[PDB]
């Protein structure tokens, strides 16, 4: 059943508070980019025979 969180509202609020806190501790921890590494990686091999 799902009638557990009507008579126990405080148990509902701490799960909502936990993921607010863990999420707010991670927005400074995330890199900001315009795109992910969608392009295939290249490895250049450059020689010289002047």
């Amino acid at each position: 059943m799902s009638q557990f969180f009507i008579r126990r509202p405080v148990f509902a609020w701490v799960i909502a508070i936990f993921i607010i806190i863990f999420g707010l501790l991670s927005i400074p921890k995330l890199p900001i980019a315009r795109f992910p590494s969608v392009a295939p990686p290249q490895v250049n091999i450059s020689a010289t025979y002047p």
Partner: protein, 50 residues
């Protein structure tokens, strides 16, 4: 070091850099370790006052 001629910096290395880094984190690690138990006790004793 603040009495030196201007333009002379400094840094800590070795055991000292790992000591200064250990002192900046104590107030945060004692903050979370008291905030977590306050949250998990509200999940068991159905209230905020207890």
């Amino acid at each position: 070091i603040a009495k030196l001629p201007k333009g002379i910096g400094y840094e800590w290395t070795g055991i000292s850099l790992q000591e200064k880094q250990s002192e900046s984190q104590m107030a945060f690690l004692l903050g979370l370790s008291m905030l977590v138990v306050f949250l998990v006790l509200a999940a068991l004793y159905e209230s905020w006052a207890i």
